[PDB]
Amino acid sequence: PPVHPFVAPLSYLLGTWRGQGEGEYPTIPSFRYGEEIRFSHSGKPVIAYTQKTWKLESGAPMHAESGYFRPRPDGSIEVVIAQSTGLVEVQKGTYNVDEQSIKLKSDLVGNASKVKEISREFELVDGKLSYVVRMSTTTNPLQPHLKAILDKL
Amino acid sequence: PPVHPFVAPLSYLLGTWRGQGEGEYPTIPSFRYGEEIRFSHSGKPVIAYTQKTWKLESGAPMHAESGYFRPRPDGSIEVVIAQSTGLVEVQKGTYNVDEQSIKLKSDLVGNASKVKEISREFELVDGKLSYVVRMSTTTNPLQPHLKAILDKL
């Protein structure tokens, strides 16, 4: 089906992306990971999102998550994600056409033992998809947990 | 990777399923839909779930959702789902090995305008996957919205 007019401003996302990231937090040792993301659609005002990650040295599967991006013509967007670890998140924010960026902060984090808020910020930089994920916990304020850069395949 | 021992009791789910369902609610006219579900895994104690639905007469895409099933050896299970419509849900309940059934009720429904609780009940019947989804709204008590039966492909 054709791309819905609400999805068209984010059409740069559509496809498969692969790259690598670094994870961190004051409470844990830093680590690296490989990541692959697919964004797809079915003609609705919604983009399907799927992630998988792995250990670089072994290819051993790590975290996965999936969900839906719902952009609107006023530049607002909501994103819902379920994670393999048993969390859900509702993200709300805005996208910027000139910057090809998306800025989100959680309205809800469900089924967490420790996490309170999550923010996710994406930007296309020289055609590569970059993001930073920040989180707050019961013992730590909102700060980075993940950063990755992915090439479009 | 091999099936994780926590996933093995639900190994009957793994694969792709296709069939059809009927949707209803006191507030809406009844409708029919086609559905396809995939259950997969990556060696973790987690089963990935993806759904798509369509109009039977046209093949036109309808609802999609995705998430993760997390069974444990005591017979408990939690399921997290994100829906294309912008909802998230945390489901908790139990599975029964002798019946090949799974019974879930929501601990949380996020980003809903109307829905309060959702329950989902699955059973394998003569090798086919059957489910009933019930929901409560601001104006209606917990009752069926969806029922479907799918054949394993």
Ligand code: HEM
């Ligand atoms: C928004 C998504 C994510 C959230 C909310 C999240 C949350 C957390 C939390 C709360 C911790 C424990 C910190 C503590 O104990 O103080 C943690 C640790 C960790 N995370 Fe994440 N995580 C996310 C994504 C990921 C991803 C994508 C990966 C791998 C690619 C990952 C790998 C790890 C690892 C290796 C640890 C240390 C071991 C552990 O406690 O499990 N996380 N994460």
Ligand code: HEM
């Ligand atoms: C647990 C999953 C679902 C939930 C919580 C849900 C929720 C709802 C709600 C709250 C309504 C409005 C009822 C009212 O206004 O009183 C509705 C209507 C409807 N639903 Fe569902 N739904 C789900 C799954 C599905 C699926 C899988 C389909 C299609 C295959 C579907 C198709 C429809 C249709 C055609 C209507 C009537 C038009 C509309 O209001 O959108 N729903 N649903």
